[PDB]
Design a protein around this ligand. Structure first.
Ligand SMILES: [Cl-]
Ligand SMILES: [Cl-]
Lengths: 194, 194
């Protein structure tokens, strides 16, 4: 019984029951071990949630550094798309990611992200805010998508009728893409004054 | 026993136990009524959550229309600040807001928001995306703030150490403000090409 196996099962369970319903007792039962055996790998729910958030990004969020051919704009664009897709992979992915601090495994790439934005001419603060922006917008976008879907069932004015169709018709994709490009334009304007 | 009273109690309960722990059975017990009596006002948890999200905005989110002296930029700026503060009023405010569709009470102001952005020279799509952006970023920002706080307890590289301090030292305020202004600059660039 190794960690990888424990977490692989936890991810399957997460899709079966969601974040609220996910407990260690439930994980222990699914794996077919006693709870004190599981304890060694996952001490509690908070520790489980942390491990899931980190593993989901390890498994699915592959655009964490700029490619050699990439501008900072391209990088932020593809990083955000990669993040969004990773959050969308798993049930309650947005709730899973929320409130997790960077993982020891992520330290070096997160450091190079910050350095890379600094070399582009952002101050450190601005770099941090720029990365925080993508993350928060992507997270809010995903949480809305996921939550809207989960509340399925139990007379709008004209412009609002079209606005609802426009957001729902593609689960927020076009709106995500537009705003991402808007955030990137706005950041270019930040660089342009120095 | 009227709706206002039911919901006032529910908001107090929400702060006491959080979104997960909030149930109708618990609400009924707090009010001191039988569950079938409560049923008439709130049919289930999903209906309760909807009513809380709507009432929290009614009670605390007052910058929903432009003031007479306001540019569209000023408006989006103050609308977003007003929203953020309203989401921050209540425990799990971000989770409460997520996945709620506009309320019949909100129809007319939401319609005027959209019209106002159209009159500024945004296409309807762009208007919808622009409003969605604020909402999603504010929501992700708030959810991170709230969730980070809730996971209190149970060696960063140099730039990352400073980035963590920078985000945590004011619970995301400076970063929210910067990105809001970045989103507004980027939207100005959208208008500038037509
Ligand atoms: Cl192991
Ligand atoms: Cl009533």
């Amino acid at each position: 019984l190794d960690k990888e196996q424990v977490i692989d099962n936890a991810l399957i369970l997460l899709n079966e029951v969601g974040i609220e319903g996910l407990t260690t007792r439930k994980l222990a039962q699914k794996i077919g071990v006693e709870q004190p055996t599981l304890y060694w790998h996952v001490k509690n729910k908070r520790a489980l949630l942390d491990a899931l958030a980190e593993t989901i990004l390890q498994k699915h969020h592959h655009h964490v550094l700029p490619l050699p051919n990439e501008t900072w704009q391209d990088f932020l664009r593809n990083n955000a798309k990669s993040f969004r897709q990773a959050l969308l992979m798993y049930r309650d992915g947005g709730k899973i990611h929320a409130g997790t601090r960077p993982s020891e495994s992520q330290f070096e790439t997160s450091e190079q992200q910050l350095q890379f934005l600094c070399d582009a001419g952002f101050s450190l603060s601005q770099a941090v805010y720029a990365l925080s922006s993508i993350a928060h917008f992507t997270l809010g976008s995903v949480l809305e998508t996921q939550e809207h879907q989960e509340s399925q069932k139990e007379a709008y004015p004209p412009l609002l009728t079209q606005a609802v169709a426009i957001m729902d018709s593609d689960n927020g994709d076009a709106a995500f893409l537009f705003v991402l490009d808007v955030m990137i334009s706005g950041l270019e304007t930040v660089l342009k004054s120095a």
